Design a protein around this ligand. Structure first.
Ligand SMILES: *[C@@H]1O[C@H](CO)[C@@H](O[C@@H]2O[C@H](CO)[C@@H](O[C@@H]3O[C@H](CO[C@H]4O[C@H](CO)[C@@H](O)[C@H](O)[C@@H]4O)[C@@H](O)[C@H](O)[C@@H]3O)[C@H](O)[C@H]2NC(C)=O)[C@H](O)[C@H]1NC(C)=O
Ligand SMILES: *[C@@H]1O[C@H](CO)[C@@H](O)[C@H](O)[C@H]1NC(C)=O
Ligand SMILES: *[C@@H]1O[C@H](CO)[C@@H](O)[C@H](O)[C@H]1NC(C)=O
Ligand SMILES: [Ca+2]
Ligand SMILES: [Ca+2]
Ligand SMILES: [Ca+2]
Ligand SMILES: [Ca+2]
Ligand SMILES: [Mn+2]
Ligand SMILES: [Mn+2]
Ligand SMILES: [Mn+2]
Lengths: 242, 440, 72
């Protein structure tokens, strides 16, 4: 009866508007099924969008206030990464949080998913990863991501340090200061943090993440389906250990 | 192997200005004195109403070692209408890129924002200033009616610049067309002769440029970095341009015809997210009279002795042969996360041995991530894989960006007139620029 | 005739959705298909009438959207 700590990381960009309803279903289905693996089960939650910096985001005050402006449509302001729920035993709290997530937006196709992975894996003190448990990080998105050096276009030339930078609002305070992390850096820290990374993406986006998974040890991929249980199967088989 | 690293000429700017972010040499006509051109994109300057607008300073080699701002622009922001600014120069990073041809100085602001005439928008179109002798004009090839993300609205023209031998300005604008990227090439005579201070959008009739394509090419960043040289034997410098996110983050580099902008050659990386195409360079490295192609891939992960992947950086070298074919070899970095290949700069025939030599930087290597620059020799067989000389950064790291010695550099100019080309290496994290002389 | 609307960027889904809803209202009996996994919307079975309206409506209201029209 070995403990399992599950962290669910949701992409809230505009491109997720078509996906979000199925992501919420995956979240609650996961919570229910995880209860079948062990009594020592806990799960947390966080989310990400993009660096709120030109040219990734428009700087006119109307659009800053509402990045979906002139569609017309209302959505949340752009932010990098937020930590919402320290992993807990309160499965009901998890579901209530996931159900109330809302759309945010940015301009370009790739997202800030790599900043979010780095902080979620690194900030042990705020996420609550146990010393003796499986550490599972589920990454949900429908797009590719930015990585180190891509931020040069935004005027950001200070390399990611791989350190935890979450303030009193649980926001990534260095979002607009440091470069997106590189894969070599994500691997270094995911291994040090003993975290297994799962990439749940849509069909067109699967091959690309499969290629990344071949570089990142312990990483797996799957398809984000309405029949989302196909992802849970990765989590379940990962529990056998032996 | 012949750089004087013991007593270099060290120049400095205002703190926080990123002095040394970009460098070049200035060589004015006739028996004039040589000067160094050092960018400082976050310099506060004295421009009314503008904060951290950026500037370029002319630094004197002959004596004294003081630097003075070049008066490209000494005004505040122009208005479109009463209490409605036309342009936003604050934080434009002017001086982030500087190039010079003879007595012509080209400097740009990649983060310059402009108000589209049509509506009260603010888009990062980019802008350049070209000083030709005593006349300075504004050049803005991405400032037009082709607005928004699908157009040139997010071009950031001036992100990368160079000059051709045949009197043309080469400009990259990586954000064009939803980040497909665009290359633009214009005549220097045309840029100045068509200039009017009250015209914001100027059409250049002899302009060459790439065009927008299918969405499959979005997020590729063509024009991220550029270089020039003859790759088809027509006597006309052709265009070399990196495309770092092409082929699903595998990365590509394109070569276009210098006369009609038609694609001639393509290079592809070997590893996803190695950022192949981050930087490019062109030079004849083996003395075969044909330009060779140097492509960086700073995030490349190699396979260590323990089977573990590790990020070291990679540079590929493609030798041009008379048949049109290329012979490609590869050089890997020496330190993990040093990002070898971040900056590549031909040095010309540094040691006067008949072959051009070249420097490759690794800005985050060395103790305390001070930054390392490697010097490699050329030979009739290609590039010698082992470096002959290593330059170490000498400054303590500060908060934020590390000194990043080797971040940017330029050579192939004999500043002290001793027969050997010299080298300028920037270290913007500590607001510094360093001149290294080449010894006999 | 066929009209192909290509949406780009993070807002592509919201723009396509808005356009798609408009098209359903303007032409509820048209064959309207989502292609390229939600990045492109294609309308076919039309006859050089809507081409003068829907293609223009999208360009006017959403200038950033690319439109390609084909007829036989
Ligand atoms: C280096 O890689 C580049 C990128 O892949 C190569 O450039 C592309 O090469 C393809 C194949 O030749 C070209 O595709 C052609 O498209 C025309 C139709 O063009 C017109 O219609 C399209 C819309 O369908 C529109 O977007 C265009 O602007 C035109 O109005 C076809 O008739 C041809 O048969 C063929 O399919 C691409 O256009 C071309 N450019 C780009 C950006 O994709 C390049 O050739 C490679 N170079 C080397 C040396 O390998
Ligand atoms: C530029 O001036 C402003 C206003 O005094 C100041 O806040 C900013 O820190 C200065 N930037 C520098 C010295 O880089
Ligand atoms: C460009 O010029 C070369 C040499 O004259 C010619 O072979 C080629 O077809 C031209 N391409 C275009 C698009 O004009
Ligand atoms: Ca040529
Ligand atoms: Ca050669
Ligand atoms: Ca030599
Ligand atoms: Ca010299
Ligand atoms: Mn998105
Ligand atoms: Mn989606
Ligand atoms: Mn994006």
């Amino acid at each position: 009866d070995y403990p399992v700590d599950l962290y669910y990381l949701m992409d809230l960009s505009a491109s997720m508007d078509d996906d979000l309803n199925t992501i919420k279903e995956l979240g609650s289905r996961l919570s229910k099924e995880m209860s079948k693996l062990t009594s020592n089960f806990r799960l947390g939650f966080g989310s990400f969008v993009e660096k709120p910096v030109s040219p990734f985001v428009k700087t006119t005050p109307e659009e800053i206030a509402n990045p979906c402006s002139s569609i017309p449509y209302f959505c949340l302001p752009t932010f990098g990464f937020k930590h919402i729920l320290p992993l807990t035993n309160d499965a009901e709290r998890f579901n209530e949080i996931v159900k109330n997530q809302k759309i945010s937006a940015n301009i370009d196709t790739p997202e800030g998913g790599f900043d979010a992975i780095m902080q979620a894996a690194v900030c042990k003190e705020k996420i609550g990863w146990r010393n003796d448990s499986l550490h599972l990080l589920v990454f949900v998105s429908d797009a590719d991501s930015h990585f180190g050096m891509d931020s040069k276009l935004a005027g950001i030339v200070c390399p990611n340090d791989g350190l935890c930078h979450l303030d009193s609002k649980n926001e990534y305070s260095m979002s607009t200061v440091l470069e997106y992390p590189t894969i070599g850096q994500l691997i270094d820290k995911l291994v040090q943090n003993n975290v297994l990374l799962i990439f749940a993406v849509t069909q067109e986006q699967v091959h690309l993440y499969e290629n990344y998974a071949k570089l990142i040890p312990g990483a797996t991929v799957g398809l984000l389906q309405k029949d989302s249980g196909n992802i849970l199967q990765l989590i379940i088989s990962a529990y056998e250990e032996l | 192997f012949n750089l004087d690293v013991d007593s270099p000429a060290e120049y400095s700017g205002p703190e926080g200005s990123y002095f040394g972010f970009a460098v070049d040499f200035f060589v004015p006509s006739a028996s004039s004195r040589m000067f160094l051109l050092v960018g400082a994109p976050k310099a506060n300057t004295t421009q009314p109403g503008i904060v951290e607008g950026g500037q370029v300073l002319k630094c004197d080699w002959s004596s004294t070692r003081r630097c003075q701002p070049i008066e490209f622009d000494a005004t505040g922001n122009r208005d479109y209408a009463k209490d409605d600014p036309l342009e936003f120069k604050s934080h434009q990073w002017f001086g982030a890129s500087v190039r010079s041809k003879q007595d012509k100085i080209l400097a740009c602001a990649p983060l310059y924002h402009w108000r589209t005439e049509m509506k009260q928008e603010r888009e990062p179109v980019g802008t350049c200033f070209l000083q030709d002798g005593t006349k300075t004009v504004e050049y803005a090839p991405c400032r037009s009616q082709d607005i928004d993300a699908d157009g040139q609205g997010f071009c950031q023209g001036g992100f990368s610049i160079d000059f051709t031998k045949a009197d043309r300005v080469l400009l990259g604008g990586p954000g064009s067309f939803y980040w497909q990227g665009q290359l633009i090439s214009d005549q220097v005579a045309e840029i100045v002769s068509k200039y009017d201070p009250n015209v914001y959008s100027i059409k250049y009739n002899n302009q060459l440029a790439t065009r927008t394509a299918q969405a499959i090419f979005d997020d590729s960043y063509l024009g991220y970095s550029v270089a020039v040289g003859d790759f088809n034997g027509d006597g006309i410098d052709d265009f070399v341009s990196g495309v770092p996110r092409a082929a699903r983050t595998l990365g590509m580099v394109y070569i276009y015809d210098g006369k009609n902008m038609s694609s001639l050659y393509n290079f592809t990386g070997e590893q996803m997210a190695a950022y192949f195409g981050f930087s490019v360079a062109a030079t004849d490295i083996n003395g075969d009279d044909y330009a060779d192609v140097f492509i960086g891939a700073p995030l490349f992960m190699d396979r260590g002795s323990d089977g573990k992947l590790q990020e070291v950086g990679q540079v590929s070298v493609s030798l041009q042969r008379a048949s049109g074919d290329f012979q490609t070899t590869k050089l890997n970095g020496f330190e993990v996360f040093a990002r070898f290949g971040s900056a590549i700069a031909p040095l010309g025939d540094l040691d006067q041995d008949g072959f051009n030599d070249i420097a490759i930087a690794a800005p985050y290597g060395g103790e305390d991530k001070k930054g390392i620059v490697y010097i490699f020799n050329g030979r009739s067989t290609g590039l010698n894989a082992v470096p002959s000389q290593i330059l170490e950064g000498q400054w303590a790291a500060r908060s934020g960006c590390p000194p990043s010695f080797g971040y940017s550099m330029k050579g192939a100019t004999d500043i002290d007139k001793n027969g050997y080309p010299d080298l300028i290496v920037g270290a913007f994290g500590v607001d510094r620029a360093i001149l290294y002389r080449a010894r006999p | 005739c066929v009209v192909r609307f290509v949406f780009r960027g993070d807002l592509a889904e919201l723009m396509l959705r808005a356009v798609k809803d408009h098209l359903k209202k303007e032409g509820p009996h048209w064959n309207i298909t989502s292609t390229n996994n939600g990045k492109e919307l294609v309308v076919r079975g039309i006859h050089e009438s809507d081409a003068k309206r829907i293609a223009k409506w999208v360009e006017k209201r959403f200038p950033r959207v690319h439109t390609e029209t084909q007829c036989d």
